[PDB]
Structures are given as C-alpha cells and as structure tokens.
C-alpha cells in the first residue's frame, strides 16, 4: 500500500575532495534532492560555528588552518528537524604540522612507555623516531597521522629525551619529549 512521504537525500558537495595551495581560493557548492524547497547552511566541523547560509561557501586567502571539516546542512523550512548533512574535507598543501612542539613526561626508572606523536599536512605525513624500535602508524584524518612507539626508560633516554620527526614531500617538522623522574 503505497506511501508518498517528505524527505531530503543526496547531499553532494562540489568539489568533493578539494586540494588548494596556500593563498588560493576555494568555492564549495552543496546539492540535495528533496520533496520541497530547501535551505542550506555551512558549518566548521571542528567548531559549532556557522559560516554562511545558502548553497555556496566562498573561501579566500587560505591559510593552513582553514583545512579540514566543512559540513553542509540541507534543511526544509516547512518541516522542523527534516535535514541531512554532508561533510567535505579540504586539503591545503603544506609541510608537516606538529600537534605539539615540546612536551614533558614524568616517569619511573623500571618502566616502558607508549609514547605518541601527532602531525598534520598535505600530503599526509609520516613520522620516524630517534630511537630503535618498530612504531605503529594510525591514520585517522586524510591529513593526520598518529605514531606510537614503545621505549624503555634508560638513563641515556632521560639524558637525551626522545624526538619524533614528521616528514612529507613539502618539508619536515620535529617534536621532542622530555623524560623526568620520581621526585
């Protein structure tokens, strides 16, 4: 027994996976098929902030920090709650970007640690460490990587510390972890 009900579907962004050089401009357009007139809005996935309403979002003079989540919201005014979202991930070309430059760890001497290192950049970077040992790479954002390495607390490591080097085809960035002890 047939039914005709209200709906919104097929929320498409264009371009789908934008790659832009720093300083260039980007124009994102949202599209949706639905059973009435629609309203459109743009969000900044990492924050709640609304950017511009309507189907097109115009960005200019892109810095590195403009990359990542943008979410289009395709709503119906006449039906509260009837919408659908679609995420677009913009990639800015740049060298690796360390999540932390210098940070400090409190440890005990008969201990092994799982240290971590985050970085961002396009193309997606890779990370290496200055101590021997196989590290595991977890990709979690088409531009972000989290490297994990197990080290044993030794006197020479308390002396030097430990540093992860995130590399990509556009350059390299580094980050160091200090190790300090029990009181």
């Amino acid at each position, epitope marked *: 027994q047939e039914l005709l009900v209200n709906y919104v579907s097929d929320v498409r962004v264009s371009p*789908a*996976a934008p*790659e832009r*050089q720093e300083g260039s401009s980007l124009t994102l357009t949202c599209e949706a098929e639905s059973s009435q007139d629609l309203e459109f809005q743009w969000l900044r996935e990492e924050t709640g902030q609304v950017l511009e309403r309507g189907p097109v979002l115009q960005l200019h003079d892109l810095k590195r920090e403009a990359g990542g989540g943008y979410r289009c919201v395709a709503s119906v005014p006449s039906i509260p709650g009837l919408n659908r979202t679609q*995420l677009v*991930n913009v*990639a800015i*070309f740049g060298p690796p970007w360390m999540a932390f430059k210098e940070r400090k760890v409190w440890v005990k001497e008969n201990m092994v640690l799982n240290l971590s290192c985050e970085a961002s950049g*396009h*193309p*997606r970077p890779t990370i290496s460490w200055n101590v021997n040992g196989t590290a595991s790479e977890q*990709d*979690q*954002d*088409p531009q*972000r990587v989290l490297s994990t390495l197990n080290v044993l607390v030794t006197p020479e490591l308390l002396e030097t510390g430990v540093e992860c080097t995130a590399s990509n*085809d*556009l*350059g390299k960035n580094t980050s160091i972890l200090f190790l300090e002890l029990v009181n």
Partner: antibody, heavy 118, light 112 residues
Framework: EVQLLESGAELVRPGASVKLSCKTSGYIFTNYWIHWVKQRSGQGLEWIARIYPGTDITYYNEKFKGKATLTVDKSSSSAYMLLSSLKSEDSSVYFC???????????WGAGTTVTVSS | ELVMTQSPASLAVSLGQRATISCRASKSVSISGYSYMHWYQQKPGQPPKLLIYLASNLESGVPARFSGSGSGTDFTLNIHPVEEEDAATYYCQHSRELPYTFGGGTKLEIKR
C-alpha cells in the same frame, strides 16, 4: 588546458639505456607530482615511480629500482625517466601522468613506445 | 604488495542495459572515511582516462552514466545505460600504500 607531451618512440639495443621525456604545460609544474606507468602489449598497468618537482623527492616501485631513474628540469617544466640496461621485457609503452596529494592521475601523456631489439 | 583483483575480465552487455565491474583489494584501501580507489577507462591507441577518483566521485566531464561505490576491500564501477563509445578496458587503482597497483583490467564488449 593541462598538457603532458612525451618524446617520440625509441629503438634501443639490448643493454643500452634510454631517457624518455615528458614536457608539461598549463599548470604550475612545481605543484603536482609526475608518475610513470608501464603498459606492455596494450594490456595491464604497472606503476613505476613518482617525483615531486618542487623538492626533487622520488619514490620508486621496488620492481623498477635499478631500471628507472626519475629526473626533473624545472627550467623547461619537463620530467624525465631513464631506463637502464634494457632487455626484451622492457619493450612497452611508458606513460607519464600528473597527480595531486591523493595519488590519482587526472592527466596522462600520449605514451612513448620503446622497442628493445638488435 | 597490494593486489587488485578485477572481475570479470571480459563483459558483453547490450546497449541500454547496465555494466557492473568489480574490484577487490587484498587489503583495505579505506582509512578515516576516504577510500583510495580510482577507476580508469582505456580505449585503443589512447592513454588511460580518469573516470572516478576516491571510489565514488565523478571526474568533471565524465557523463553521469558512470558511477563508483564501495569501501574497504570491495568496489564497483557501474555504467548505465551503456552507449557505443563505452567499448573500452576499465581499470581500478589504489593509492593507499606504495607501490601503487592496478587491477588486471576489464574489457567491455557491446552487443548489437
């Protein structure tokens, strides 16, 4: 319009080498990667290597290490591949292709035929 | 390395119906919501031509008859409704790891 133009067909003796060229136009040459693929007798596609013209950084397929050498001349906005110590199994068509940070090939060259024969 | 298995190798579909080509990777080429699988079309005498990038996105200039879908290991190129000019060989390719590999290829024959 983005254009990738490859050098002419080649006749090389076994054991000798050849330097294929790929002259680019229509885009900032230092902002895109250049890849080379091999297609033998019209079927199949092998990825050989890639080079970034901005920083001269190259990554090779381990199948082709010692066979291919990727060079770039930013003056003429051209990428080059050097095939070394040729034998009959190298007689194929070699394409150059452009790519971004996601490593998919939007534009391809016409293809240089290489014949390795005495 | 990372192998791509295309099925079938040959495909004969009548004009106006649908062609469904499959591509299975030995390892997942999807991470973080991106599926690094791409599709190409190759006509005789011509180089490969990009159809679909990142599993599902249509390249500008490619008619809406072409569509791609899938995730992880399983991907499918759909052509509907097939026209005469669609007679070609179709390849998948991944950009998840290095080295980049291609599928074996699928040649589409058009019934008339």
């Amino acid at each position: 319009e983005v254009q990738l133009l490859e050098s002419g067909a080649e006749l090389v003796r076994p054991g000798a080498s050849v330097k294929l060229s790929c002259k680019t136009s229509g885009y900032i040459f230092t902002n895109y990667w250049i890849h080379w693929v091999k297609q033998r007798s019209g079927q199949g596609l092998e990825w050989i290597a890639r080079i970034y013209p901005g920083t001269d950084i190259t990554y090779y397929n381990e199948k082709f290490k010692g066979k291919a050498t990727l060079t770039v001349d930013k003056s003429s906005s051209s990428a080059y591949m050097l095939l070394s110590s040729l034998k009959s199994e190298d007689s194929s068509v070699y394409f150059c292709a452009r790519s971004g940070g996601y490593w998919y090939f939007d534009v391809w060259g016409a293809g240089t035929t290489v014949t390795v024969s005495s | 390395e990372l192998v791509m298995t295309q099925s079938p190798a040959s495909l004969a579909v009548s004009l106006g119906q649908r062609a469904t080509i499959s591509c299975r990777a030995s390892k997942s080429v999807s991470i973080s919501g991106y599926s690094y699988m791409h599709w190409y079309q190759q006509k005789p005498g011509q180089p490969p031509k990009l159809l679909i990038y990142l599993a599902s996105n249509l390249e500008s200039g490619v008619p809406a008859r072409f569509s791609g879908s899938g995730s992880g290991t399983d991907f499918t190129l759909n052509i509907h409704p097939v026209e005469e000019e669609d007679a070609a060989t179709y390849y998948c390719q991944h950009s998840r790891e290095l080295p980049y590999t291609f599928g074996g290829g699928t040649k589409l024959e058009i019934k008339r």
